[PDB]
Design a protein around this ligand. Sequence first.
Ligand SMILES: [Mg+2]
Length: 69
Amino acid sequence: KLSAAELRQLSGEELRNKVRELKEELFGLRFQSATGQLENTARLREVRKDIARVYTVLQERNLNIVDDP
RNA sequence: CAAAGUUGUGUAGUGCGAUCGGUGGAUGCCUUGGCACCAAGAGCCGAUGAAGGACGUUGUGACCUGCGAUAAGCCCUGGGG
Ligand SMILES: [Mg+2]
């Protein structure tokens, strides 16, 4: 899974929790990469892409491009 | 055999020719680059912060191109497969 437009079915607070969880996962991945672990390197970019998606949804809600749930 | 006389000279090197190579990158044939134009556009950008940059950004060392900590990319829409 890589997240998609179903993030628009979530609420603001749980989307922000999603942001925090994604940031923590990226932190762990970066530490693994530094320490020599993390064979799965593509996730290291996909997590940042997911953060971008969640910020996209939040900003469209904030700017009223899409009606806020 | 002696006497008198004649002629000859490449083991150092060199010249010329032929031949076989080396160096060199001319020539010929090209080209992801230029040059001069034609036709149609567009003729402004900027405090909603420009022109141009610095630094950063990739699974990984650099540089170029793109991008800006949402960082060779995020979303919507249409096309295409
Ligand atoms: Mg003209």
